[PDB]
RNA sequence: CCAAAAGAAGUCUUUCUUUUGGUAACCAGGAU
């Protein structure tokens, strides 16, 4: 959720065009976007068209307008330099595609390929007067809508809300990663900083539940301290524990704690169940769903949740307001818990 | 086609009463007024008399008056008049 | 006529009424002792709850109450949980899937506000819609699917009836439906296996029962021979006693009829029951249908690229005609739109040819249960075309299934669509809100209040024109227009005597006893001539759409009007200057000057056409020969009007023909034609969108809000 | 205090002071946070998701006994509805599915006399894992469908030489409520669903009477005061379409801002007497004071 | 992939990316 | 372990030989894990007689009709298929049923041997006229539950004997349903309902109670692996 | 004056209201629900809201 | 046609915590029912034992850190979760563990009372470290099916007590087969063969003597109707 | 309508009397 936030562009604020006064021309998904900002992740209600996501491998340059990178083709050559092109300079050119068949010589198998013209027309172009290519697949997708296994099989309307409810989930007590992924989670895990990672390459000398002194090369020692049972904003739990031992070695950029939905490493927000879909008596009629009783045996789906409660005494004109457990018209009974000092 | 024994707040059928009045608008106030009336009854039973009377049909262990009112005017034991 | 609500619910609303039984039970001293109790939860005021709760009826609403059954009363009772049960047949009245809903619970006090949640609000005394009479609480999805599943004859099934063959006799014959169940048991019958049986206690079809009993009837007890299958004898226990055997396979069509025959001829508490028992039965059948989805039983077309290529040779020339000059942009475009609207139909074509009939998907497709042969072509087979931002059809085209995996261009040429469509959705959740709080405040004030105004003024209906050659057609939209009305005047044909008399419902059986005398037109009643003072009268309204006998003397039919009118809007799909969808609705209700103006003409005669440069330029001669009529700024980019060939020079008119090509301002039709004019054409237009979205209203919702469009006269001389 | 509908542990408590030379907002002597923890179970009503938009809330949940079981004795942990795949076109799901019960079970290509043309393109060491195998299929660029299927062909047994699965992806589930194996075979495999923050214990909320506004007299609103249900304006057309007048003038008089209707509706509820007859909501006495103060003679006439 | 302790998560990818996924909080 | 409340069972008897038995209440769910098996108990473990063959004369290679009477073979097999009859010799024995001139056929007509017995004899069966005969041939012998027509296994012995189905159960038709109950704060425990429909050679209870008899000798066998094994124990009655 | 104030305009309906010295009948529905009172509809009506409720003479008498 | 040879029951030993019952011969139909109808028993209705509380020293709830250990409550929690033991006595009993020192902590640290028995001493519980000092006291008692936690309020109990969802179940996984035999000559019958698989707290043997006894006693319910 | 204190009766813990004490508007984020 908070990478999702960092990496996201509004078109409303102060400066900016308002919701209830948002068209649906400037809702829309230009054909200029293509690499930019993600087609498919975007709020689904009255936001919907105002709100995006950085793709990722945009930049910004010093002016303000998005760039990606591209591969330029040199006399049908499949180069590797990489050049970055902002949206008019991608107009002028012919743009091909990065799932194209390169013959392990910078070559296309074939002279006709799909590609991008002036107004994002799609055509298909002999292959020689192909300017750029893109440098992959998943250049047009965002962080979050790049964890979706089997995009490509799956309608935009349910990608996006995949996508956008993937930023809901709750931390559980324990976690696991997935069996079938998309590769994403591991960068995506250590980008956003929840786990904690090996500063320097060293030697582990003392690991605990709240700590791990790591035993630099050269003489130096560091010790990191680690979040226990805290609260974030929205009151889910933000553990993080250690996973490694008192005497490995560990390299620099190495993850050597745990976070909140980090399973050594990469982002796990769910489980692995066993699925029937089948139909079953009627109880999992209408988008409704069945469960088994093994999952709250075994406490697979259990999540921990804080609230914060804030309290303070002030002058006032009249002065001294007190914290005590001496309060007028209540019982003993209803100040046993009460430490000496309220 | 007959039907099968109705099952609690669906006892009696409603086509049977209709047939009893005009409109459903009217078997409304007709039930609503006459389960008023038993529940005056019941609060004055154990004080002083008073004209209100009822129920004609044996009520149920805990029985609601708008029940008992609705099953007499199935069974044709009330009369009502219109404005 | 039940739901569930958790006890921790119960309990805190019903905290006054066990708090008195607490006492009264002498299980508290006072009121202050049972309160205690209540508060603490001890396990008494559990046993005290439950009966405090029975036949107390509690109201369940959910937001947005577009229409009346968006709250109904139902008789709680206590669940485990937090979470409110809902009964499966009350989804489509509330609109509640179960993604995440929430509903909120009321409780009536006083002895009328329980009364009026028994009476009026309660869950199966609401069955039909109000908009049109089209029953809600019918089988859908899974129990459509079940139902589908059990009452279907595979040949050469398990245990098939088989003729003697001289040497054993006839097998598959069944002393009784009890024996059947038996050998289904066994495994050596199956329950869509055709066979000979025996019944007793089904009543048989008419032709079985004229040609067998004569007498009366078959009387239950007598015993008839059926050729069937064990799941059609199973369909057949479900529905009532006297009703005929139905041997037909249930497609969702059969099911929607046999209920709306069993609403007609029963009482409620009849439809009710037989809909709970088909419930039942078809989650049953649901769960052992056998339908589940993996990626063997998506087959593909066997030779989508022997297609595939044979129209890219097409659009290849098409394209080599155009690089060789021989047509500007816009005709390659058409050209290759047509090619690949023809490939994808060829597509279809043999995807549809190469499923058998069990396969998962395109049962579920076929047994009505939910989708439509467009969403399984773009699965299996083809996408297709896709638009552009503009609309425009992109002319590549997407090339791939769902279940192949388009690439990263098709993809994101698809998403451009997608993204209009979730937008239109978003945008117009708020329009159809605004636009019916608009209308419940302009007809507020239309209530029946006497029950015959007596009046003899009346519209007509045009039921059936007749055919060239000779012959009745029926009128396809006979339900919406002339259905639930009364007569205005008498039926008589061809000097036969009164076929149907004046003031007479006119249902089904009267339209067909006219369509078989031989007339064509009838005078009916309306709200649009009632002559009451103050509101409508119950014999000018008509039938009730929902209760189905003539409507009562207290009723506000302007609500039920603009709820009908205004809760199908979210499915009203905005459509690509003519306005043609909710704008459109909007402006007609609104008398606004419409966007694509056409002009009318004003007296008959013959029209002479001057084609101007950069607008036309047409005047009527007039028969008469008063004054000729012009109308000198007309774009070149409208059409000219066709009725019966386009307008040609020296063609004749009448006088309120319409001359351009899009939508007339009522306000001109209304000086020109009267009021009975644009009367008619307000109807015809507000249900000709609605009809073009497939929504059944019934005409009268939408003549009480014309009646109150036409209230009031302008003041020209004081 | 701690609000309605919450409780738990203790777990920390955080105290500022101004005698330590703490920095406090100006004119505050003292400050102390004390932080509750609650850890919850899955339950009906919360919230479920795939990575394919499959959401839904949770129906029912089953004891182990009564639910469908493989040959072998297992029984499967979540079923899905048939009815909501193939309409909304999100057919990653199933393929996941497929995906999941291989590496769950874990394969073996056999390249006993050369390696099969469906695994001709296929990487190395793909050509066999082992059981509880993680694999990656990248957005664009994954796993083929000819490549699922071989890899369904070929998969591990379990403990005896059974496979459950067959080439298919369908498996012969018991029904575990009855006993009798369901007639055609079903899909499994293997799905990775999110726990959504939507639970019920926060959504859930009931008022007998409590706390009510101080302008006008009507109750409060949200769950941490008590508050009420609103009854907008749709559902008074609603009511007023069905033509329920005293279900009407009661939710509006005596339920909302009769302040003397509310005591005496209490007093014969819980007294077992007649509910009495509604008055004059105070909203409307607001509306004519307010009125009258923009200089309008607003005057009831009799 | 290029971090030094990850898991092994075997990829079905027939291509090769040039171009490393940037910084993403940059 | 003591159970805590225990389950009664009461009868609401509708017809004759038609019931509806009610136990409750249950653990959350022993609903389902008895009733079904009592359904299949009661349907295919109570022993009964039946029809099994019969030889009707002048039928031999056409199958049609018969000659002389009016309804045809099928007919006639399916009416002696719905035959109550009760049978003590294990041994199939052998029954004639055999009358002239015109009249109607009923199943009192038949003589029964030393032990047979038909529980219905006022059953219509045929029809004759013109001075018809019938003399068909019933074979009866005991079994269990419902066995499908049995082809012949010698064909040479007989060649008019013509095989029929069985229904040897003396219940015909058994459904049950599972319900919810209690204000004990649980609104969760079970109650199953029977419906028994027997027919008129035994009643609706003295089935249930051979039915429960066979289970509990069925799990007894299960029972005395470890006598002294801790169980659920319900208490006296 | 008091349902067009309610529906939409309301500073302009009150202002000229308040110049013509409008007077309200109280006859509509949603007047009726402002003020507190029952509807002039469905169950809300004098033929119905009037309704006398007697038990039969042979009632009284078997009691 | 009456077939009057009476079932019989058979057991085949696999291993020591697993084996095979084959019933036969059954009446046609009546295999699925039977198997089913013991596989419902086994697995809800078997009594055994299960820890329902701990009591750490050093801490005061479920979400806090022990100084020296690897593992945090929580975690600690979760593992003790999966022991398998055995009592005898009904009324509850306590169990101690104290360990001093670095080195892994397993189940046979745990000092059981005379009665109760730990049946897998190579579980893990923790790691320590040279400053960790681990000592909890595990209460352990009897019944059936899973229960969760009991609140602490509800129980007169200090604040370190630790309330834990209870499992009373010793079976594992069952399944069953049955082997029809349908011959022309209509003389059939059935064939049970019935898989249980224990946690090595009772055997096979003894799981299904307590499901018969269940069993018989609910069908003697409906035996003694006359 | 609730809390606290005092007095009286009985029960071993309820009743009677006296005194004191007793919310909104903005902005933002979500859901259907
Ligand atoms: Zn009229």
């Not at chain 1, 002028?92 to 013209?117: C, K, M, T, W, Y």
């Not at chain 7, 309200?24 to 003020?35: A, P, R, Y």
């Amino acid at each position: 959720s908070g990478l999702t936030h960092k990496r996201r562009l509004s078109a409303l604020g102060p400066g900016g065009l308002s919701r209830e006064r948002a068209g649906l021309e400037v809702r829309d998904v230009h054909p200029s976007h293509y690499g930019r900002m993600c087609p498919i992740e975007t709020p689904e209600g009255p936001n919907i068209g105002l709100i995006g996501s950085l793709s990722v491998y945009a930049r910004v340059n010093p002016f303000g307008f998005i760039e990606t990178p591209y591969r330029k083709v040199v006399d049908g050559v499949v180069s590797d330099e990489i050049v970055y092109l902002t949206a008019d300079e991608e107009d002028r050119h012919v743009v091909a595609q990065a799932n194209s068949p390169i013959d392990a010589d910078g070559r296309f198998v074939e002279p006709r390929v799909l590609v991008r013209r002036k107004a994002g027309e799609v055509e298909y172009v002999p292959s020689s007067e192909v300017d750029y290519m893109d440098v992959s697949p998943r250049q047009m997708v965002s962080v979050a809508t790049a964890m979706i296994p089997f995009l490509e099989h799956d309608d935009a309307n349910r990608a996006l809300m995949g996508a956008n409810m993937q930023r809901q989930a709750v931390p559980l007590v324990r976690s696991e990663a997935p069996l079938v992924g998309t590769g994403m989670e591991l960068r995506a895990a250590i980008d956003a900083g929840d786990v904690v990672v090996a500063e320097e390459s060293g030697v582990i000398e003392e690991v605990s539940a709240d700590y791990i002194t790591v035993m630099h090369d050269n003489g130096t020692r560091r010790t990191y301290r680690m979040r226990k049972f805290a609260r974030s904003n929205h009151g889910t739990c933000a553990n993080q524990c250690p996973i490694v031992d008192a005497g490995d070695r560990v390299e620099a950029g190495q993850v050597i704690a745990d976070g909140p939905c980090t399973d050594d490493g990469e982002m796990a927000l769910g489980k692995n169940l066993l699925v029937a879909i089948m139909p079953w008596e009627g109880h999992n009629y209408e988008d409704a769903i069945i469960l088994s009783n093994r999952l709250v045996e075994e406490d697979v789906l259990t999540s921990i949740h804080i609230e914060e409660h804030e309290i303070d005494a002030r002058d006032t004109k009249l002065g001294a307001e007190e914290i005590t457990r001496d309060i007028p018209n209540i019982s003993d009974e209803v100040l046993a818990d009460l430490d000496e000092r309220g | 086609g007959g039907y099968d024994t109705p099952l609690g707040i669906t006892n009696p059928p409603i086509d049977e009463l209709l047939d009893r009045v005009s409109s459903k608008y009217a078997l409304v106030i007709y039930a609503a007024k006459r389960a008023r009336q038993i529940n005056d009854y019941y609060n004055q039973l154990g004080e002083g008399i008073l004209e209100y009377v009822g129920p004609l049909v044996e009520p149920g262990l805990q029985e609601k008056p708008l029940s008992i009112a609705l099953r007499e005017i199935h069974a044709d034991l009330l009369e009502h008049t219109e404005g | 006529h039940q739901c569930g609500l958790p006890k921790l619910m119960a309990l805190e609303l019903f905290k006054p009424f066990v708090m008195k039984r607490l006492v009264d039970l002498n299980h508290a001293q006072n009121i202050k002792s049972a309160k205690r109790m209540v508060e603490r939860q001890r396990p008494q005021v559990w046993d005290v709850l439950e009966e405090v709760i029975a036949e107390h009826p509690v109201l369940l609403n959910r937001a947005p109450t577009l229409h009346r059954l968006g709250i109904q009363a139902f008789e709680p009772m206590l669940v485990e949980g937090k979470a409110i049960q809902l009964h499966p047949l009350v989804c489509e009245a509330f609109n509640a899937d179960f993604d995440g809903d929430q509903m909120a619970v009321h409780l009536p006090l006083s002895a009328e506000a329980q009364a009026e949640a028994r009476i009026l609000m309660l869950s199966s005394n609401n069955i039909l819609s109000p908009a049109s009479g089209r029953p809600l609480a019918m089988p859908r999805l899974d129990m459509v699917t079940g139902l589908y599943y059990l009452t279907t004859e595979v040949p050469g099934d398990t245990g098939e009836y088989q003729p003697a063959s001289g040497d054993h006799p006839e097998t598959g014959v069944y002393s009784s439906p009890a024996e059947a169940i038996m050998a289904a048991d066994r495994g050596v019958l199956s329950v869509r296996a055709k066979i000979k049986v025996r019944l007793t206690q089904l009543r048989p079809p008419v032709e079985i029962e004229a040609e067998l009993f004569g007498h009366s009837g078959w009387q239950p007890g007598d015993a008839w021979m059926a050729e069937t299958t064990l799941g059609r004898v199973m369909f057949n226990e479900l529905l009532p006693l006297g009703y005929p055997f139905v041997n037909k396979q249930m497609h969702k069509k059969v099911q929607a009829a046999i209920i709306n025959d069993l609403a007609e001829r029963y009482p409620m508490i009849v439809v009710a029951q037989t809909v709970d028992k088909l419930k039942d039965a078809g989650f049953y059948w649901a769960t052992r249908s056998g339908v589940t989805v993996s990626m063997a039983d998506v087959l593909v077309p066997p030779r989508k690229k022997e297609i595939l290529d044979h129209y890219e040779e097409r659009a290849d020339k098409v394209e080599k005609q155009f690089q060789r000059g021989a047509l500007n942009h816009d005709e390659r475009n058409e050209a290759l739109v047509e090619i690949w609207k023809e490939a994808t139909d060829e597509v279809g074509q043999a995807l549809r040819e190469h499923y058998p009939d069990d396969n998962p998907i395109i049962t579920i497709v076929d047994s009505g249960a939910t989708g439509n042969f467009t969403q399984t072509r773009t699965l299996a087979g083809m996408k297709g075309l896709v638009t552009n931002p503009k609309g425009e059809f992109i002319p590549r085209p997407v090339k791939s299934s769902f279940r192949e995996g388009l690439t990263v261009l098709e993809y994101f040429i698809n998403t451009h669509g997608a993204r209009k469509g979730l937008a239109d959705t978003a945008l117009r959740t708020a329009d159809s809100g605004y636009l019916t709080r608009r209308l419940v405040d302009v007809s507020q004030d239309v209530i029946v209040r006497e029950h015959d105004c007596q009046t003899e003024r009346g519209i007509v209906v045009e039921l059936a024109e007749r055919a060239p050659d000779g012959t009745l057609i029926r009128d396809p939209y006979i339900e919406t227009s002339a259905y639930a009305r009364t007569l205005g005047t008498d039926a008589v044909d061809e000097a036969g005597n009164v076929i149907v008399e004046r003031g007479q419902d006119l249902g089904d059986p009267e339209i067909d006893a006219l369509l078989a005398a031989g007339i064509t037109q009838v005078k009916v009643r309306s709200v649009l001539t009632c002559a009451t003072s103050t509101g409508v009268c119950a014999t000018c309204y008509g039938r009730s759409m929902a209760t189905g006998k003539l409507v009562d003397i207290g009723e506000a039919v302007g609500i039920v009007a603009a709820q009908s009118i205004g809760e199908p809007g979210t499915q009203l799909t905005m459509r690509t200057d003519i306005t043609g969808g909710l704008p459109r609705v909007q402006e007609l209700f609104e008398a606004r000057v419409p966007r694509g103006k056409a002009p009318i003409a004003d007296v008959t005669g013959r029209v002479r056409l001057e084609d101007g440069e950069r607008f036309y330029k047409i005047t009527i001669v007039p028969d008469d020969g008063g004054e000729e009529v012009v109308y000198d700024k007309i774009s070149k980019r409208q059409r000219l009007r066709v009725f019966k060939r386009v307008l040609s020079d020296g063609d004749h008119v009448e006088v309120g023909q319409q001359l351009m090509e899009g939508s007339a301002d009522p306000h001109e039709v209304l000086r020109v034609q009267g009021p009975r004019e644009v009367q008619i054409h307000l109807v015809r237009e507000v249900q000709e969108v609605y009809r073009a979205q497939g929504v059944s209203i019934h005409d009268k919702h939408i003549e009480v809000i014309v009646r109150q469009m036409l209230r009031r006269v302008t003041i020209i001389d004081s | 205090k701690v609000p309605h509908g919450e409780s738990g542990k203790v777990i920390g408590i955080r105290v500022f002071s101004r005698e330590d030379e703490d920095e406090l907002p100006a004119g505050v002597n003292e400050l102390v946070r004390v932080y509750v923890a609650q850890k919850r179970k899955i339950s009906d009503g919360d919230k479920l998701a795939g990575r394919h938009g499959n959401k839904g809330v949770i129906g029912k949940i089953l004891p182990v006994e009564d639910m469908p079981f493989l040959a072998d004795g297992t029984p499967v942990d979540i079923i899905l509805n048939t009815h909501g795949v193939p309409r909304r076109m999100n057919i990653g799901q199933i393929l996941e599915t497929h995906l999941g019960w291989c590496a769950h079970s874990g394969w073996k290509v056999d390249a006993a006399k050369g390696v099969p043309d469906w695994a001709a393109r296929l990487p190395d060491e793909l050509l066999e894992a082992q059981p509880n195998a993680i694999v990656s299929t990248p957005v664009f660029d994954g796993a083929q469908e000819a490549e699922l299927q071989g890899l369904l062909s070929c998969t591990l047994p379990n403990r005896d030489g059974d496979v459950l699965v067959d080439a298919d992806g369908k498996a012969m589930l018991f029904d575990g409520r009855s006993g009798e194996p369901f007639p055609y075979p079903v899909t499994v495999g293997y799905m990775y669903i999110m726990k959504l923050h939507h639970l019920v214990d926060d959504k859930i909320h009931a008022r007998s009477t409590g706390p009510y506004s101080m302008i006008t007299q009507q109750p409060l609103g949200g769950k941490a005061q008590f508050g009420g249900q609103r009854f907008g304006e749709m559902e008074c057309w609603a009511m007023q379409a069905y033509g329920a007048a005293y279900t009407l003038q009661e939710l509006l008089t005596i339920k909302s801002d009769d302040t003397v209707g509310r005591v005496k509706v209490y007093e014969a509820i819980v007294k077992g007497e007649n509910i009495p007859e509604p008055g004059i909501p105070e909203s409307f006495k607001v509306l004519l004071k307010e009125l009258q103060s923009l200089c309008l003679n607003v005057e009831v006439l009799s | 992939n290029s971090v030094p302790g990850a898991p092994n998560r075997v990829s079905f990818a027939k291509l090769r990316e040039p171009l490393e996924v940037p910084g993403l909080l940059d | 372990m003591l159970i805590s409340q225990r389950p009664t069972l009461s009868e609401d008897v509708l017809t004759d030989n038609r019931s509806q038995f009610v136990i409750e209440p249950l653990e959350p769910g022993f609903g389902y894990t008895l009733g079904n098996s009592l359904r299949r108990t009661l349907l295919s473990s109570i022993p009964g007689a039946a029809v099994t063959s019969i030889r009707i004369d002048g039928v031999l290679h056409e199958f049609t009709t018969v000659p002389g009477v009016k309804e045809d073979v099928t007919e006639i097999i399916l009416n002696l298929k719905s035959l109550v009859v009760s049978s003590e010799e294990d041994e199939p024995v052998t029954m004639y049923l055999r009358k002239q001139g015109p009249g109607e056929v009923t199943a009192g007509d038949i003589v029964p041997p030393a032990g047979v017995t038909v529980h219905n004899p006022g059953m219509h069966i045929a029809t004759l006229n013109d001075k018809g005969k019938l003399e068909v041939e019933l074979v009866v012998e005991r079994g269990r539950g419902y066995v499908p027509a049995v082809q012949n296994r010698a064909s040479g012995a007989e060649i008019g004997r013509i095989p029929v189905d069985s229904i040897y159960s003396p219940v015909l038709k058994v459904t049950y349903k599972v319900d919810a109950t209690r204000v004990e704060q649980r609104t969760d425990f079970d109650k199953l309902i029977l419906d028994v429909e027997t027919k008129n050679s035994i009643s609706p209870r003295d089935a249930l109670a051979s039915a429960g008899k066979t289970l509990v000798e069925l799990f007894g066998l299960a029972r005395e692996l470890n006598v002294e094994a801790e169980g659920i124990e319900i208490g006296p009655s | 004056w008091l349902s067009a104030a309610s529906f939409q305009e309301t500073t302009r309906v009150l202002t000229d209201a308040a110049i013509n010295c409008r007077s309200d009948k109280l006859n509509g529905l949603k007047e009726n629900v402002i003020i507190g009172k029952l509807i002039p509809a469905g169950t809300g009506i004098n033929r119905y809201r009037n309704i006398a409720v007697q038990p039969t003479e042979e009632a009284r008498a078997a009691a």
